[PDB]
């Protein structure tokens, strides 16, 4: 079946780690997609966003390969992006799905004004940049919906954000850079220091230290 090759994979298969937030807290790299499948696999959905052909010139013509862009998300604060290039479309799509699973990140959602109910928009103004494409997200009031193009709109929908205002500059017709800028903007949500985070951090044992004895075998 699955034979983990990493300490994190062993812990996830042994049920020692039960939530993706435990891994996110210590910023540990995730190198096996079975970890994500076990943790949040049931609620994850995938979608192929674009199949892009690329060509390399050779002495005997053009060698064509296909680029697959895949977005995964649970619609509840987790989203991932995957890009893979392969000779066959199916292989590229499979690799892109694996990479999108491996890159899932937590998305912070906040309130525009009054803080009643679940969060509905981005906590603050965030901006992402890939290549020349820059994507800006602005908090929006409840009921405003997702005001974004179809690619950013899909990325935001997979992240579970209910309403947001967006603006884009640059070559947004470069779909890869557009989606990557949106992904970077979403990732930057948890890096902004707000007054609610001013409390002193109270550290907890890392999984590799907490379960060192188990991993010692």
């Amino acid at each position: 079946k699955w034979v983990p090759v990493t300490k994190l994979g062993r812990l996830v298969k042994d049920n020692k780690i039960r939530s993706l937030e435990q891994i996110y807290l210590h910023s540990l790299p995730i190198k096996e997609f079975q970890i994500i499948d076990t943790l949040i696999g049931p609620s994850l959905k995938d979608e192929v966003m674009k199949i892009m052909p690329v060509q390399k010139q050779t002495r005997a013509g053009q060698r064509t390969r296909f680029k697959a862009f895949v977005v995964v998300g649970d619609g509840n604060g987790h989203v991932g992006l995957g890009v893979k290039c392969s000779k066959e479309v199916a292989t590229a799509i499979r690799g892109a799905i694996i990479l999108a699973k491996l890159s899932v990140i937590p998305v912070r959602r906040g309130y525009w004004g009054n803080k009643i109910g679940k969060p509905h928009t981005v906590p603050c103004k965030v901006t992402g940049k890939c290549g020349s494409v820059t994507v800006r997200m602005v908090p929006a009031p409840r009921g405003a919906g997702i005001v974004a193009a179809r690619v950013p709109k899909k990325v935001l929908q997979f992240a579970g954000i209910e309403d947001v205002f967006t603006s884009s500059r640059g070559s947004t017709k470069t779909l890869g850079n557009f989606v990557k800028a949106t992904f970077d903007c979403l990732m930057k949500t948890y890096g902004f220091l707000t007054p609610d985070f001013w409390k002193e951090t109270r550290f907890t044992k890392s999984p590799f230290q907490e379960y060192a004895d188990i991993l010692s075998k």
Binding site: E21, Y24, L25, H26, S27, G117, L193, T201, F203, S206
Partner: protein, 83 residues
């Protein structure tokens, strides 16, 4: 972040750099967490007791992690009677 009722709403509370106060993100693989063990009157390590320091990738890439950690440990040892 909390609701009007008072319920915790955030997915998790990220750690903060012990020196720069920056938020340590999930994909920050240059960040480290260190435990400094405490010693009794006989210079023997007391299991389970230590001071924890976290450093973000930004400070470590700058080369300032060493001096910052030295200063933080000096202050914490002075406070904790570890000499």
């Amino acid at each position: 972040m909390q609701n009007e009722e008072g319920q915790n709403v955030d997915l998790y509370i990220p750690r903060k750099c012990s020196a720069t106060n920056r938020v340590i993100t999930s994909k920050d693989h240059a960040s480290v967490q260190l435990n400094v063990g405490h010693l009794d009157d006989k210079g023997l390590y007391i299991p389970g007791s230590f001071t924890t320091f976290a450093l973000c990738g930004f400070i470590r890439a700058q080369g300032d992690a060493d001096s910052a950690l030295d200063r933080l440990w000096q202050k914490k040892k002075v406070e904790a009677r570890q000499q």
